[PDB]
Curated annotation (Swiss-Prot), chain A:
Biased composition (Pro residues): 29-41
Region (Disordered), start-end ranges: 18-41
Name of the molecule in the record: DNA-directed RNA polymerase I subunit RPA34
Modified residues (Phosphoserine): 26, 34
Its biological purpose: Component of RNA polymerase I (Pol I), a DNA-dependent RNA polymerase which synthesizes ribosomal RNA precursors using the four ribonucleoside triphosphates as substrates. Involved in UBTF-activated transcription, presumably at a step following PIC formation.
Quaternary state and interactors: Component of the RNA polymerase I (Pol I) complex consisting of 13 subunits: a ten-subunit catalytic core composed of POLR1A/RPA1, POLR1B/RPA2, POLR1C/RPAC1, POLR1D/RPAC2, POLR1H/RPA12, POLR2E/RPABC1, POLR2F/RPABC2, POLR2H/RPABC3, POLR2K/RPABC4 and POLR2L/RPABC5; a mobile stalk subunit POLR1F/RPA43 protruding from the core and additional subunits homologous to general transcription factors POLR1E/RPA49 and POLR1G/RPA34. Forms a heterodimer with POLR1E/RPA49. Part of Pol I pre-initiation complex (PIC), in which Pol I core assembles with RRN3 and promoter-bound UTBF and SL1/TIF-IB complex.
UniProtKB/Swiss-Prot annotation, chain B:
Protein's cellular compartments: Nucleus, Nucleolus; Chromosome
Organism: Homo sapiens
Gene: POLR1B
Source species taxonomy: Eukaryota, Metazoa, Chordata, Craniata, Vertebrata
Protein name per the record: DNA-directed RNA polymerase I subunit RPA2
Free-text note on domains in this protein's UniProt record: The active site comprises the fork loops, the loops and the rudder that stabilize the transcription bubble and assist polymerase translocation.
Subunit structure: Component of the RNA polymerase I (Pol I) complex consisting of 13 subunits: a ten-subunit catalytic core composed of POLR1A/RPA1, POLR1B/RPA2, POLR1C/RPAC1, POLR1D/RPAC2, POLR1H/RPA12, POLR2E/RPABC1, POLR2F/RPABC2, POLR2H/RPABC3, POLR2K/RPABC4 and POLR2L/RPABC5; a mobile stalk subunit POLR1F/RPA43 protruding from the core and additional subunits homologous to general transcription factors POLR1E/RPA49 and POLR1G/RPA34. Part of Pol I pre-initiation complex (PIC), in which Pol I core assembles with RRN3 and promoter-bound UTBF and SL1/TIF-IB complex.
Record's disease association: Treacher Collins syndrome 4: A form of Treacher Collins syndrome, a disorder of craniofacial development. Treacher Collins syndrome is characterized by a combination of bilateral downward slanting of the palpebral fissures, colobomas of the lower eyelids with a paucity of eyelashes medial to the defect, hypoplasia of the facial bones, cleft palate, malformation of the external ears, atresia of the external auditory canals, and bilateral conductive hearing loss. TCS4 inheritance pattern is autosomal dominant.
Role summary: Catalytic core component of RNA polymerase I (Pol I), a DNA-dependent RNA polymerase which synthesizes ribosomal RNA precursors using the four ribonucleoside triphosphates as substrates. Transcribes 47S pre-rRNAs from multicopy rRNA gene clusters, giving rise to 5.8S, 18S and 28S ribosomal RNAs. Pol I-mediated transcription cycle proceeds through transcription initiation, transcription elongation and transcription termination stages.
Similarity field: Belongs to the RNA polymerase beta chain family.
Length: 51, 63
């Protein structure tokens, strides 16, 4: 138990978690565009001129 | 006189008002590549980023 000074280390291992990327890199999934306003069907001339 | 000073939030914007315990987040960051602020960053600090978690300097990340 003299606890002498040992030599300098050769290198460094570093352990850390890696993320999973099987999900991302996929084609994007955007929010679907709301439709442009379309005229309602069944619009008729309700007003007829008097006389 | 108050033009540009008295602003209004957008309809989607909202103010964070919840308070949580962030005691697990620095150990989570160190499980990722964030070296602790005492330990050596294993690269030059000129090739690293300072990490801040709510005004607490957590450590350093290899860029």
């Amino acid at each position: 138990g003299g606890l002498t000074c040992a030599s300098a280390p050769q290198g460094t291992l570093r352990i850390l978690e890696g993320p999973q990327q099987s999900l991302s890199g996929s084609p994007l999934q955007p929010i679907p565009a709301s439709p442009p306003p379309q005229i309602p069907p069944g619009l008729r001339p309700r007003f007829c001129a008097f006389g | 006189e108050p033009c540009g000073l008295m602003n209004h939030l957008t309809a989607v914007c909202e103010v964070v008002t919840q308070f949580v315990y962030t005691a697990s987040i620095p150990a989570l960051l160190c499980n990722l590549g964030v070296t602790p602020i005492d330990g050596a960053p294993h690269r030059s600090y000129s090739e690293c980023y300072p990490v801040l978690l709510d005004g607490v300097m957590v450590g350093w990340v290899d860029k």
